[PDB]
Design an enzyme around this catalytic site. Structure first.
Site: not given
Ligand SMILES: Nc1ncnc2c1ncn2[C@@H]1O[C@H](CO)[C@@H](O)[C@H]1O
Ligand SMILES: Nc1ncnc2c1ncn2[C@@H]1O[C@H](CO)[C@@H](O)[C@H]1O
Ligand SMILES: Nc1ncnc2c1ncn2[C@@H]1O[C@H](CO)[C@@H](O)[C@H]1O
Ligand SMILES: Nc1ncnc2c1ncn2[C@@H]1O[C@H](CO)[C@@H](O)[C@H]1O
Ligand SMILES: Nc1ncnc2c1ncn2[C@@H]1O[C@H](CO)[C@@H](O)[C@H]1O
Ligand SMILES: Nc1ncnc2c1ncn2[C@@H]1O[C@H](CO)[C@@H](O)[C@H]1O
Lengths: 221, 220, 221, 220, 221, 220
Positions: D203, D161, D23
């Site tokens: 998400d 978990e 990115r």
């Molecule tokens: N559901 C999520 N949980 C934790 N990190 C997330 C999530 N969605 C995106 N991220 C970001 O993307 C990366 C983990 O996929 C990390 O750098 C985090 O900041």
């Protein structure tokens, strides 16, 4: 029970709890009549006898929270013991506490994790049974002993790299260091039975009297 | 001091510490003679008067470890106070503790971090001064009160999402919940002065109150 | 409620929260019209009045997380309050923060255990309501005040044996020390209502302005 | 520095910090002119170019507090960087936070021990630089984005978990989960430099992304 | 999986886990035949190839507990991987550990909170799979390498304000500092699969060898 | 030393450490020649004798981290002991660990605070001396024993209100519960000496014992 081989009914409802099993033997031999030895598992001697007409027991606990916790749990849960008086030694933190002083623990501080596990996020302060405490205090006063009622440290570590925090506790009035009281008081409280620790100051961090202390513990228990 | 506007010498060496400053006012008015009000900073009333020939003070503390810590520190360090007796209320955890019982705290559990900060890795058990405790216990017994000596919880949170741990503490013989004793006992121990908490059971999780004040004054 | 004697409907949905109940009285007397005092329980004065046509309340909280938590819980849960703005004092940690500066707390650090108990294993960062924060910031800017938006320490202990960690927090940009914000922000978040703390720097660790600060808090709330 | 092979002066004082080095590449290619790649150590791409006449850099951080801490420490201490804006993704905890919303973190909660180690006994609340936050908020508002300013969780564990505590944090208004902000904000505060995190909700537990990069560049 | 784009079946049951994805590329290019690159998501290269007739994979993990935890969880849960051998670098704490020594981690200490969250009140000691450990140790011994089996520190912070506790850990025999092992060992244990970390000492706190280390890791895995 | 009445030189550099002093007696009587008892303080029997031409000692430790810590500290610091092998029992957590299996602890988990006090903010993982571990493993393999090398829990509490976390640890491959290893391994590491724990599975949450003593003696 797992660590005590003595039948049902062989252990008296009142019991003294020296750390040293050989002191249990000394106490039974010196003070008790009609004595039986009810346990030799792990050499952790336990006896029952009669003192001034009452059945009383005396059981070694070993050193440290985990060791005494084993025996105390089994005594309460398997043998229905109701009054438990630790009779031990301890090390004075501060100058105003003298060798051969008798300390009666109102409560105990600790570096053990035992209570943090049980009450996460809380500081649990293990408390003596006041009725027993008063009884022992009055007996010790009547006996002409130097009796100090106050706070003690129940230590996991006898040998510390630095005594800085022990000194600090002394600055907050903690009288002496020993290695059982937190467990005894907490477990007694858990099961709704009565506990006390009566300690002779044997050393500093920085026997005639012992007999008198056993006498007041017997009287209280 | 920062939170007490009293001149040096205006506060007595023996002091009662209700949480409620209006109860300090009530105590001073009801029991003391030759009363002066020495503090109104933040409405946290403090008085000094005479009880049976002895000067005694009575000072509101507010609610919670941080509030009482402020006043107790200032009283000890700036005013040379030597005997401090909290006179408060508490909520019974257990069935066997009854409303209007008097509880004398031998020690206190807490959810406060105050002592974990001071003694990292240790559980500090704040202890009452035994001499004062005995004096109050004997006075309360003589008075014909229901007096219970035992453990209390000093809570940071009055409103708890779950009272599961409070119930568990009650199962380990903790008698009641209140919000000051840990601080009072710890700071008194720090400075080598004498503290006690004497509490009226007011709820579960007056004539009684007057008798309790009387035994606190006597012990004090 | 347990600590507030005021009816249902007597407390406005917007409320200012000074630590000092006598400041609540000062605020009500100085700024509000059609004032009623709705509480004197524990001398913790609370008032409701009108400011520029809107009902607003002002309630003392006392000092410290436990004290403010009591009042905030009751205000939200028993009285349906929706906008809560603490108006307090604080002590500057560092040299770049000046006496009489107005600090608007974005968040608060703490030595309290309140949030460790609620979120074991987590560091909870209590956050201001941004809408209120922006509103107060803009009002303070318009007013010509020195307004600093940033981090504060919510302390349990006013008197510390060592200020080493307080100094360290100052090195990490923590602006000032006070004794309520963590609780206010956390409880507001819990109940989905809006909170902010606006503080006047009254001292260092190492009134005309106050009125202007009350004005911006009234305007925001 | 240990993890960045750039010569002194090759990194701009303002820098964007995506977690994903690809990115960083996308941002440099899409938005910047006069681009040079100053780092390929561990594939953690870093670029410097010009955006509307100002030099700006863009540097991948990797995922998680320890990874971003390495880069942020080196950028600040070895390259004299002054304004650091994380541009990332996050997962919404709550229903009211929608996919493609832009979240600007005012502060961050964490399950990391990084700050408990530094400030034993304290909860450290890492705070955004307000000036940068306001600048980004105003830019995002002007852009017509859905911008939410609030709290996030900086997680050590992506796979948990149980998400019980994550749900509980959502109940306390924590908007989304991500894995870097605590570190960025804490280290920026340590060194007296300016940090912000601007996040796209990707998400629940692009055109939007481009607009978010634009507001981060503008704030930067 | 979320962070790995490789199909079902594309990743071998045995896998090497360098922190640096460019080392994954180096390992695949240097040691493996019939190589395919199965992942470029986030540039975190993963390859599968054949080594002496067995399919094996090699996957970058990135630096730090959180990063490796992501990949390890996905490899085990989504791709059915069974043997995971981290091949990394580390920094020697003490003088008796030399640059280019190979360290095989029996266990790892950590300043991470990952395990305190999972096992509140407990210290979890992450343990290598002994079978893999023995296999790697024997291979390294046969290879003529200086192999040290012992304890390492898995650090969250590469840059520490003070190295005092790191030095203290060195005094308790902790050999070196790195940033992944706690996670790898804990997650492998969680899912009942086999993990090991084999590390080359690249620096002190206070390539021909690398190839030989990869060879013993390939042999073990 | 405080808890061991032995004269300087009476304790061998290699020592076995059963929890039960009566097992020390059994080991000395069963396996050693030219035996002397060097300690009866607190009934915590210690012996020195000869096994296949080498002096070796055997010393009861008592149960629990604090008890074994006392003896191990004194043995190392006052008696110059260099190789310490705990020979104990343990309780299997998991189904795949069977009664009479021999467990050699590579490391130990714990609910003790001993290491949190020493290394605040860190999880210390106490590690066996690998040389001794290999020696014992090879001896046990040669002996035809079922030998498992792995993780154990060193418990402070034998009687737990809930065994939920013990079960969870078993789910993470922790093999068995016992009450000493954390202390032995940590203190040995502190003083740069060599320790190992070899354990017989005696329960779930003799001929076998003799063979285990033999491999411990051999490793020792
Ligand atoms: N559901 C999520 N949980 C934790 N990190 C997330 C999530 N969605 C995106 N991220 C970001 O993307 C990366 C983990 O996929 C990390 O750098 C985090 O900041
Ligand atoms: N100085 C001391 N430190 C710790 N425990 C002590 C000390 N003196 C006596 N004891 C008591 O004796 C045993 C340790 O020698 C323990 O059971 C403990 O209660
Ligand atoms: N149920 C209770 N919980 C907590 N504090 C209580 C309770 N009942 C009385 N108190 C006391 O009264 C105040 C809180 O109402 C505190 O000062 C506290 O000591
Ligand atoms: N230096 C200070 N330390 C702590 N609290 C302070 C300070 N200055 C002002 N305060 C505020 O005033 C009260 C303590 O005097 C608290 O309510 C707190 O918020
Ligand atoms: N001195 C060191 N401190 C921490 N991690 C190190 C060190 N040397 C090498 N490493 C390893 O390399 C990366 C950090 O540079 C991490 O993946 C870590 O495992
Ligand atoms: N189930 C068990 N739980 C804890 N300790 C055990 C168990 N079985 C055997 N032990 C060992 O035996 C003693 C406790 O009975 C301790 O010394 C401990 O190491």
């Amino acid at each position: 029970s797992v660590h005590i081989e003595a039948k049902q009914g062989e252990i008296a409802e009142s019991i003294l709890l020296p750390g040293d099993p050989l002191r249990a033997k000394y106490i039974a031999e010196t003070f008790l009549e009609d004595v039986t030895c009810y346990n030799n598992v792990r050499g952790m001697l336990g006896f029952t006898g009669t003192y001034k007409g009452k059945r009383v027991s005396v059981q070694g606990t070993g050193m440290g929270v985990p060791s005494i916790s084993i025996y105390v749990n089994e005594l309460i849960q398997s043998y229905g013991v109701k009054n438990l008086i630790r009779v031990g030694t301890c090390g004075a933190i501060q100058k105003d506490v003298k060798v051969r002083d008798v300390i009666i623990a109102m409560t105990a501080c600790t570096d053990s994790n035992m209570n943090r596990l049980t009450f996460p996020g809380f500081d649990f302060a293990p408390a003596a049974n006041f009725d027993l405490l008063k009884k022992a205090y009055d007996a010790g006063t009547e006996k002409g002993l130097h009796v100090r009622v106050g706070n003690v440290l129940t230590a996991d570590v006898f040998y510390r790299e630095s005594m800085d925090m022990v000194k600090k506790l002394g600055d907050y009035g903690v009288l002496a260091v020993e290695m059982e009281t937190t467990a005894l008081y907490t477990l007694a409280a858990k099961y709704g039975v009565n506990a006390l620790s009566v300690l002779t100051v044997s050393d500093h961090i920085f026997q005639t009297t012992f007999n008198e202390m056993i006498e007041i513990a017997l009287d209280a228990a």
